[PDB]
Each structure stands twice: as C-alpha cells, then as structure tokens.
Amino acid sequence: GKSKKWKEILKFPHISQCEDLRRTIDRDYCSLCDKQPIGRLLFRQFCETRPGLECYIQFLDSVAEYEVTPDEKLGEKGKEIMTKYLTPKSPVFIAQVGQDLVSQTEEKLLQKPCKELFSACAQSVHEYLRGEPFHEYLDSMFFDRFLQWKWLERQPVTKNTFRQYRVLGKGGFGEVCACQVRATGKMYACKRLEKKRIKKRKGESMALNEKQILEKVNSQFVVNLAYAYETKDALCLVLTIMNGGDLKFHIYNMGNPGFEEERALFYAAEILCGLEDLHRENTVYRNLKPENILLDDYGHIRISDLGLAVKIPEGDLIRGRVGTVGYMAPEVLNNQRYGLSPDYWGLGCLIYEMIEGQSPFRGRKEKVKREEVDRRVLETEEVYSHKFSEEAKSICKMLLTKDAKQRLGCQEEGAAEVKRHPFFRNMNFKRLEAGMLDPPFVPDPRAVYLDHTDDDFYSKFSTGSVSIPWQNEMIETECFKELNVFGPNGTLPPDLNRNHP
Ligand SMILES: Nc1ncnc2c1ncn2[C@@H]1O[C@H](COP(=O)(O)OP(=O)(O)OP(=O)(O)O)[C@@H](O)[C@H]1O
Numbered sequence: 393g394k395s396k397k398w399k400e401i402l403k404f405p406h407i408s409q410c411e412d413l414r415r416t417i418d419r420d421y422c423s424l425c426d427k428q429p430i431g432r433l434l435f436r437q438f439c440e441t442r443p444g445l446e447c448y449i450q451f452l453d454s455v456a457e458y459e460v461t462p463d464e465k466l467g468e469k470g471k472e473i474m475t476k477y478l479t480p481k482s483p484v485f486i487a488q489v490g491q492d493l494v495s496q497t498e499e500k501l502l503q504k505p506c507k508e509l510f511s512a513c514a515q516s517v518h519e520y521l522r523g524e525p526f527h528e529y530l531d532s533m534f535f536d537r538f539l540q541w542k543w544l545e546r547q548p549v550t551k552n553t554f555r556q557y558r559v560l561g562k563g564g565f566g567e568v569c570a571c572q573v574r575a576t577g578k579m580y581a582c583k584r585l586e587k588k589r590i591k592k593r594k595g596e597s598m599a600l601n602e603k604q605i606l607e608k609v610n611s612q613f614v615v616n617l618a619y620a621y622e623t624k625d626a627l628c629l630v631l632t633i634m635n636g637g638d639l640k641f642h643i644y645n646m647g648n649p650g651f652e653e654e655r656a657l658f659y660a661a662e663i664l665c666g667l668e669d670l671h672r673e674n675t676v677y678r679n680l681k682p683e684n685i686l687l688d689d690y691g692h693i694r695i696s697d698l699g700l701a702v703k704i705p706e707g708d709l710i711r712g713r714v715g716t717v718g719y720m721a722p723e724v725l726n727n728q729r730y731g732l733s734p735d736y737w738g739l740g741c742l743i744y745e746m747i748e749g750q751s752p753f754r755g756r757k758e759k760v761k762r763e764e765v766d767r768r769v770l771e772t773e774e775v776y777s778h779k780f781s782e783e784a785k786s787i788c789k790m791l792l793t794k795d796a797k798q799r800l801g802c803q804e805e806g807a808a809e810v811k812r813h814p815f816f817r818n819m820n821f822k823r824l825e826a827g828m829l830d831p832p833f834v835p836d837p838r839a840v841y842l843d844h845t846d847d848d849f850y851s852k853f854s855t856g857s858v859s860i861p862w863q864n865e866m867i868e869t870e871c872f873k874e875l876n877v878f879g880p881n882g883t884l885p886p887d888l889n890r891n892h893p
C-alpha cells in the first residue's frame with residue numbers, strides 16, 4: 393500500500409549529510425546493535441561479511457531458540473548446539489567463550505536441561521563483540537548506512553506523512569482515526585487531541601504526561617507510540633492499531649457470560665507482562681478495566697488508555713483518588729500514598745471477571761449505588777464459584793488483598809512473584825513473550841467488533857517519530873529490505889561513497 397514514489401520519500405541521503413549525526417550519537421553497543429532494530433540488523437549484516445564473526449551470530453540465534461524451546465525438547469536442543477558451536481573441530485566454533493566455560497556447559501547439560509543453559513556463554517559472546525568487532529562496525533560502511541537510516545527517522549512528521557481513514561473512537565479530548573503511513577503503508581491508530589479543549593481544561597500536563605509515558609514504554613502488550621505531531625487543528629498520537637475489539641465485549645457479548653479458566657489465563661498472562669514492562673519504567677497504570685484491554689488482529693492483547701497513568705519516582709509514593717468505580721483499590725479509594733500496588737488489585741479484578749463473568753463486588757444483575765461498591769471493596773470479602781480452580785482462587789484473593797502491603801506482586805520482587813504463582817504453573821512466559829503461544833480467540837479479519845502562549849508545550853509534544861517503532865515499521869513493511877541495498881560484491885553504493893555526490 394506504499395505510494396508510487398515511496399522509494400523517493402525514503403531515499404537515503406548522501407553520507408555527507410549525516411556528519412552531524414555521527415558526532416552526536418552515542419556509541420553504545422546495546423543501543424546500536426540490539427535495542428534499535430535497524431541498528432541490530434546492520435551489525436549482524438556486518439558480522440556476516442567477516443567470516444570470523446559469522447559463527448557468533450549463528451550461535452546467539454540458536455541460543456534464542458533454546459530459551460523458548462519446549463520444556464521436553466530442551467535436552468535435545470542442548471546437544472545440537474554443543475556438537476556445532478561448542479566443539480573445537482566443528483566449522484563454526486565460537487572461540488572467545490573459553491575452554492573452561494565450555495566444560496562447564498557440559499556439566500549443566502548432564503544435570504537436567506535448564507532454559508538458562510547457554511545464558512553464561514551468550515554473555516561471553518556479547519562481551520567480545522562489545523570490543524573490537526563493534527569498533528570495526530562503527531567504521532564500516534554498515535554504520536554509515538545506519539546513519540542514513542537515522543537521518544530518515546528524525547525527519548519532520550506532519551499531516552502529509554499519513555493517510556487518515558475512518559474508524560471508531562471518541563475520547564475525552566477528541567476522536568480516533570485509522571491513519572496509514574503513506575511511504576510505508578503501515579496501519580496505525582491516530583488519537584486526535586483537539587487544541588481548544590485542552591487549554592480551557594488545563595489538560596496540557598495530562599496530555600504531555602500521557603505522550604511521554606506512551607513513548608517511554610515499548611512492550612508487546614501495551615499500545616506503543618510511533619509518531620507524535622501537530623496539525624492546524626489538533627495534536628495527534630499515532631498508536632498501535634487494535635481491530636479485534638476490547639476485552640469487555642468478549643467477556644459479555646462474545647463467548648459465554650465469561651471465559652474459560654485456561655482462556656482467561658492466557659489474557660491474564662499477557663496483561664501481567666504488560667504491567668511488568670510498565671513497572672520497569674516505575675510507571676503505574678491505575679486504569680485496569682476490561683474495556684481497556686484491546687485485542688489485535690491475531691488474538692493477543694495490549695493495555696490501552698494510559699492517560700490515567702503516572703510515572704512514580706523510584707523510592708517514592710504518590711496520592712490520588714482516580715479510576716473507575718469498582719476497579720479502584722482500597723488504598724486509592726481511601727486516598728493514600730500508594731505505589732504500583734493498585735495495578736495488581738486491578739489484575740485480580742480482571743482475572744475474577746473473566747472467569748466468573750461479573751465484577752467481584754458488583755454483580756451483573758445488581759443495580760447498586762456507587763457507595764455500596766466502595767463499601768464491598770473495603771469491607772466485603774469476594775466469593776468464588778466452581779469456575780475457579782484451586783489455583784485460580786488463590787491468585788485472585790492474593791491479588792485482591794485489602795492490605796496493599798501483603799498483596800501479591802506488591803513486594804520487593806515485583807511481577808516475578810506473580811508469574812511463579814501456581815495459577816501460571818503451565819504458562820511458559822519465556823514462550824509467551826516471544827509470541828510462540830497461540831491466542832485462544834482469533835478475531836476474524838472482516839469482523840468489525842488561540843494565543844501566542846502554549847506554543848512552548850506544543851513543541852515539547854510534537855517530538856516527531858519514535859525511534860524503535862519507526863525502525864520496526866520500516867522492517868515489517870519491507871522498506872528496509874528493498875532500500876537497504878549496497879553495491880555489488882561488497883562495494884560502496886553511490887550514497888555511501890564520498891568521492892562523488
Ligand atoms: N488501538 C486502537 N485502534 C482502533 N481504535 C481504538 C484503538 N484504541 C482505542 N480505540 C477507540 O478509540 C476510542 C478513544 O477513546 P479513549 O480511549 O481516548 O477514551 P475513553 O475510551 O472514552 O476512556 P478514558 O476517558 O479512560 O480515556 C476508544 O474509546 C476506542 O473505542
């Protein structure tokens with residue numbers, strides 16, 4: 393769905409145009425060879441040229457496959473990796489691992505197969521690439537090509553960069569549309585924030601807060617921010633598109649009054665991962681409700697509606713009675729200094745409501761006032777049914793602990809405490825986070841489930857494209873493969889040769 397002249401829009405600039413990028417970018421290994429997708433691919437492509445570095449890339453790949461290998465096939469994958477990479481005579485043999493650490497891997501294999509077997513060897517392969525191989529790549533043509541990709545990334549994002557279609561949406565500040573990137577054709581979701589409604593409502597702080605939080609988090613289970621630009625009539629937020637309806641619709645309208653045990657476990661697992669990724673940024677969500685868990689095209693879920701979120705400084709608490717009736721934790725209802733605990737309360741509400749088919753403190757039939765719901769949350773102990781297994785009951789009443797100090801996941805450990813819970817005894821999060829596991833429900837594709845002031849913050853908001861989502865977009869749409877073309881037989885293409893502009 394790309395424009396007819398898309399190859400001109402994303403045309404590489406001459407390497408001479410990237411001299412100010414070269415002098416400011418930080419030469420960090422993890423950022424330029426891993427975190428950034430296009431940067432990662434280029435370093436890998438650099439290691440593919442030199443033959444001595446080829447095996448190290450093949451090795452790390454086979455390690456990634458082992459971490460997600462089914463628990464049973466771990467023993468088989470362990471011997472395959474050994475006989476190929478960790479045997480001196482073999483052709484592709486990583487040497488910088490050391491003769492001692494390979495003998496250690498042999499004992500680990502003999503004492504049962506653990507998913508973290510080669511974790512020690514992988515960290516040894518990286519520590520080697522961080523040195524000479526990385527600095528050679530920094531001088532190689534591939535890094536020059538990376539600079540050209542950064543030059544495109546940081547280009548101005550305006551209205552003419554997209555192709556607004558029409559879809560559902562009408563939030564507190566505006567509406568939502570289906571914007572498509574013209575040069576790449578990738579579908580997105582545009583969240584228009586009208587200009588006038590923000591100034592009179594003193595929303596500049598909550599809109600900028602929502603934008604910064606949306607870009608500062610990159611998780612497969614939370615709506616990501618790809619672009620943030622301004623137009624002559626509103627402020628746009630380009631977010632991930634979710635065409636599989638929301639979770640509230642599927643709990644009640646779709647399926648039976650609820651979900652099955654196992655089905656709810658899957659959605660609970662990905663929500664738990666989404667919260668973990670937010671909590672690595674010490675950012676609390678506080679708005680965990682069924683209709684804010686959207687499904688994508690393949691059946692997976694993402695947490696959306698991060699406007700009610702806030703970033704908590706490490707080692708500090710925040711106060712605020714905000715949220716939705718029935719989904720507010722007692723410490724929030726009482727308006728106390730809380731941290732991340734309200735999100736694990738809401739998680740209990742989500743697990744309960746998916747398995748039973750109603751809120752833990754508000755029946756689906758009950759016409760109760762907003763005060764009685766708050767009373768149950770603070771005083772009443774929820775009851776369970778034969779729909780909950782013994783483990784399902786546990787994780788709920790542990791996540792629904794009135795005292796936030798003893799609530800599951802609200803300890804020093806964090807989300808790791810919840811993944812161990814016997815309720816997730818059969819969930820392989822190593823495989824869930826890699827998309828290896830299949831969702832339980834697949835949405836059918838065809839289914840349709842002024843003034844001079846304030847100009848200061850308008851530029852603080854309209855920051856342009858986001859780095860990692862933009863590089864992913866180029867890879868998914870296959871713009872990277874088609875454009876990332878060098879000269880024949882390892883030769884500098886015209887755009888990477890300085891002798892002729
Ligand atoms: N990723 C998406 N793809 C397509 N449509 C979406 C997507 N995300 C949200 N929408 C739709 O656009 C609407 C935008 O409304 P918005 O989420 O901003 O506020 P709200 O739903 O009214 O609740 P709140 O006040 O807590 O934000 C959503 O209600 C939803 O219907």
Ligand SMILES: [Mn+2]
Pocket residue numbers: 563697
């Ligand atoms: Mn919303």
